Each structure stands twice: as C-alpha cells, then as structure tokens.
Design a protein around this ligand. Sequence first.
Ligand SMILES: O=C(O)[C@@H]1O[C@@H](O)[C@H](OS(=O)(=O)O)[C@@H](O)[C@@H]1O[C@H]1O[C@H](COS(=O)(=O)O)[C@@H](O[C@@H]2O[C@@H](C(=O)O)[C@@H](O[C@H]3O[C@H](COS(=O)(=O)O)[C@@H](O[C@@H]4O[C@@H](C(=O)O)[C@@H](O[C@H]5O[C@H](COS(=O)(=O)O)[C@@H](O[C@@H]6O[C@@H](C(=O)O)[C@@H](O[C@H]7O[C@H](COS(=O)(=O)O)[C@@H](O)[C@H](O)[C@H]7NS(=O)(=O)O)[C@H](O)[C@H]6OS(=O)(=O)O)[C@H](OS(=O)(=O)O)[C@H]5NS(=O)(=O)O)[C@H](O)[C@H]4OS(=O)(=O)O)[C@H](O)[C@H]3NS(=O)(=O)O)[C@H](O)[C@H]2OS(=O)(=O)O)[C@H](O)[C@H]1NS(=O)(=O)O
Ligand SMILES: [Ca+2]
Length: 370
Amino acid sequence: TQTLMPLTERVNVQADSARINQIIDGCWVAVGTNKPHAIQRDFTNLFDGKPSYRFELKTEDNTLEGYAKGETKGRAEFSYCYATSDDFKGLPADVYQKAQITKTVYHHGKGACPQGSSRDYEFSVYIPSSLDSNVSTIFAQWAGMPDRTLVQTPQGEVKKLTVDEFVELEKTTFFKKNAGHEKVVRLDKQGNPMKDKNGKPVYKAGKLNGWLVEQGGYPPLAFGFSGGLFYIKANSDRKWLTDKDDRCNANPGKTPVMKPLTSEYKASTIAYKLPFADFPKDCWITFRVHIDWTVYGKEAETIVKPGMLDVRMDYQEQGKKVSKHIVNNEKILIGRNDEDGYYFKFGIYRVGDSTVPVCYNLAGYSERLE
Ligand SMILES: O=C(O)[C@@H]1O[C@@H](O)[C@H](OS(=O)(=O)O)[C@@H](O)[C@@H]1O[C@H]1O[C@H](COS(=O)(=O)O)[C@@H](O[C@@H]2O[C@@H](C(=O)O)[C@@H](O[C@H]3O[C@H](COS(=O)(=O)O)[C@@H](O[C@@H]4O[C@@H](C(=O)O)[C@@H](O[C@H]5O[C@H](COS(=O)(=O)O)[C@@H](O[C@@H]6O[C@@H](C(=O)O)[C@@H](O[C@H]7O[C@H](COS(=O)(=O)O)[C@@H](O)[C@H](O)[C@H]7NS(=O)(=O)O)[C@H](O)[C@H]6OS(=O)(=O)O)[C@H](OS(=O)(=O)O)[C@H]5NS(=O)(=O)O)[C@H](O)[C@H]4OS(=O)(=O)O)[C@H](O)[C@H]3NS(=O)(=O)O)[C@H](O)[C@H]2OS(=O)(=O)O)[C@H](O)[C@H]1NS(=O)(=O)O
Ligand SMILES: [Ca+2]
C-alpha cells in the first residue's frame, strides 16, 4: 500500500508555464530541490480527508546562495501562483517568449491578489516532536511580484522600460539575480559557441555593467521558526525600485512584538513570537489569516494607507478545541510598492545559513475575499 509518494516535478514560475503533469492537486506547482524526499504526498497523515504534504530537507539539501558571500539556503515549497499553457493559448507566440525573458510568465497565471486588496487565507501545519527546536525555516510566506522592466541605469537613474526595451537590454546584459553583467558568449575548450537542450545559445556573466533590475526582496509576510522561536514577520518596502542592499529585517528574538524596525523605505515587524517548546506538536494547527495590504503611492513612494494583519491559531488540545487570537487586528505596514500583488507559498525555506534538518507537514490551503 502507498505510504509516501514523492512529488518531484518542479516549475520555474517566473520563466516557464507549468505543464499539466507538473500541477499538483489541480492548484499547486512545486519549487526548489527535486530530491524525492523533499516533497511527498503523505497518505499516513490525512488532513480534512485528504493526504497531506510532507516536506523535508536533510542536512545537505541547501542548493541556494544567500545575500552574504558563502551563505547558503534551501528550498522545497509549493506555489499557489503559476501560469499554464492554457493561459497563453490563442496569443502570438512572442507574448510567452517575451514573458520568459522578462521573467513575468506567472503574471499571466492564477494565484495572485492585487495591490492594496483585502484577503483571507487559511492553511494548516503539522509539526512532529522530531523537529529540532533550533531549525531556521519559514513554513509559509506571501511573496511579492516585482516586474524587472523597472530598472536602474549605470548612472543611477530609475527607469520603467517597455517589454521590448527590456528585451533589447537583455540582449547585451546577463542578470545575476538583480545585477547586470556584460553578456559574454560562452565557448568550449575548442572556442566553439555552446548550445543547450534546445540548441539555444548559452552565455556567461562578465563584469558588472551598471544595470540593475527589480528582483527578489523580502516576502511581505512570513511564518517560521528561528532562534528557538515561532514567529510571524511582516515586511513593507515603499521604495518604487527596491534597494536590495537595505537589509532592514527584524530579528525574532531581539525585536519587540509589534514595534517595527525601520529604514528610510522599509519596515520589518515581528507581529507575534512564541517559544518553540510552546508550539503544539504532533497535531494539526490551522491558521486563519486576514490581510489588508498596505497601499503605496507608486512613483511618489508614499504610504497612502497602512495595512492590517489578523491571525487566529486553532488546534486540538486535551481533546478540546482551542483558538488563540495571536495577532489581533493589528494596523501594520505590509507589502511592496509594485504594480503587481502577492501570492502564497508553503513548505520549507531554510535560511540563516542553516543546515539543521527540517521536516513537517502542510495542507488545507484556501483563500477568499473579505
Ligand atoms: O542555475 C544554477 O545555478 C544551477 O542550475 C542547475 O545546475 C541546478 O538547478 S536544478 O534545478 O537544475 O537542479 C543547480 O545546480 C543550480 O540551480 C540552483 O541554484 C540557482 C541559483 O541560485 S543562486 O542562489 O545561486 O542564485 C537557483 O535559481 C535561482 O534561484 C531560484 C530560487 O531562489 O528559488 C529562483 O529565484 C526566483 O524564485 C525565488 C523563489 O520564488 S518561488 O516562487 O519560485 O519560490 C524568488 O524569491 C527569492 O526567495 C525569496 C523568498 O523565498 O522569500 C526572497 O528571499 C528574500 O527573503 C528572505 C526571507 O526574508 S524574511 O523577511 O522572511 O526574513 C531572506 O532571508 C532572510 O533575510 C536574511 C538577510 O536579511 O540576510 C536573514 O536576516 C538576518 O541577517 C540580516 C543581515 O545580517 S548581516 O549581519 O549580514 O548584516 C539581519 O539584518 C537580520 O536581522 C537577520 N535576521 S535573523 O533572524 O537571521 O537574525 C534572515 O534570517 C532570512 O530569513 S529569516 O526567516 O531567518 O529571517 C533572503 O535573504 S537571503 O540572504 O536569505 O538571500 C531574501 N533574498 S534577497 O535577495 O531578496 O535579499 C527573494 O525574493 C528571492 O531571493 S533571491 O535570493 O532569489 O533574490 C526570486 O526572486 C526569483 N528570482 S527571479 O529572477 O526568477 O525573479 C531562480 O530560478 C533563480 O534566480 S535567479 O536570479 O538566479 O534567476 C535554482 O532554483 C537552484 N535549483 S535547485 O534545484 O538546486 O534548487
Ligand atoms: Ca517596486
């Protein structure tokens, strides 16, 4: 009988549409390392009558680089936002091709909410007693959607390029995350141009050429464990073009609850914290999250209207129903000053250059209006 079933298909949501065989349970796509044990359907642990999702990253499963040199991180998550082939059906072939280049493929897919909207989210997590108290992982996060056609020229001027102008720039610039490098033709030992799986030319990253594109950035909301604490962290970035060098980020252990750490353009708030030992183990915990996203002033870079965060934590204890109003309708700055909105993800995002093993289950996602 089936116990655990590995779900190994992975999708690059920013640069590729998901194929039908990669979609999980009709509403998810997986991102991160493809190890069989990374993500598995779990028939031994049902949530609401359906097999749950078991996530696991062993000590050597980090495959990503952090912002600081040498630092690493790991990822095995599900994204509720992705585009499918049906999303591009009927359109000229170049729409999808340009979307791959601008890495905005998922802008054509379902799963994201608009800027400044009000939404309800719900999901459940199961933390086994085997989880080490000192893990450094985010198990649920709401990510932003920056459009890289917003760039900074070598001079330092911020400019919103058209898709075609960005395509033009991309022809001479190789982007490593948000930083532009001279696009160098990659040759083999015999100085011959290298191709890939589809016979498409391959390139290399030369020296920095001064260009920067909007990319990355802290997730506006994250649920996780760090420094022996369960915490909920909200982030706000009002700058039109995000500055990745501004590392304004609240420390769960050192930052007081609901007292935002701020820089000129960012605010990072620890909305709630709890000792890891007090987080219920070996049972399903359901979080009901309501978010009123902060409204930003675009080019003006102003906070037009503050946001709002509300969180309820429900679980069974002593056979009794428990519901903790852990974040009580708190006015807060939450979101990013972008044209597009946000999407949900859950699973494992091991950060802080940690390699402590992580394993837990997630299930029952739902979102609605309010
Ligand atoms: O290619 C290659 O390489 C290769 O290939 C092949 O070969 C293979 O592959 S396969 O697949 O085939 O196999 C391999 O080999 C490879 O691949 C691999 O790799 C690659 C590359 O990588 S690298 O890394 O190298 O680059 C890859 O690819 C890539 O990547 C990917 C990924 O990543 O995934 C992608 O990307 C994309 O996507 C993503 C995701 O999404 S999805 O949807 O898909 O999922 C995106 O995003 C990202 O991420 C995000 C998230 O997740 O969130 C973000 O991040 C961020 O945020 C975070 C968090 O926050 S919070 O608020 O929550 O917290 C952070 O973290 C944090 O923070 C930190 C800091 O700050 O740092 C910390 O804090 C701390 O510290 C600080 C500082 O201090 S000092 O001292 O230093 O001063 C302080 O202040 C404070 O206080 C503290 N705190 S405590 O508490 O600690 O005390 C913290 O901690 C943390 O956390 S916590 O929680 O703890 O808090 C971060 O940071 S870091 O550092 O970590 O980094 C952030 N970041 S940033 O930058 O922003 O800053 C974002 O958004 C992002 O990131 S990034 O990095 O990425 O940016 C993105 O965006 C996208 N991009 S696009 O372009 O697309 O758009 C893709 O694909 C790519 O990218 S690219 O660019 O390249 O294109 C791949 O994937 C792989 N593959 S595998 O398989 O291997 O895996
Ligand atoms: Ca922006």
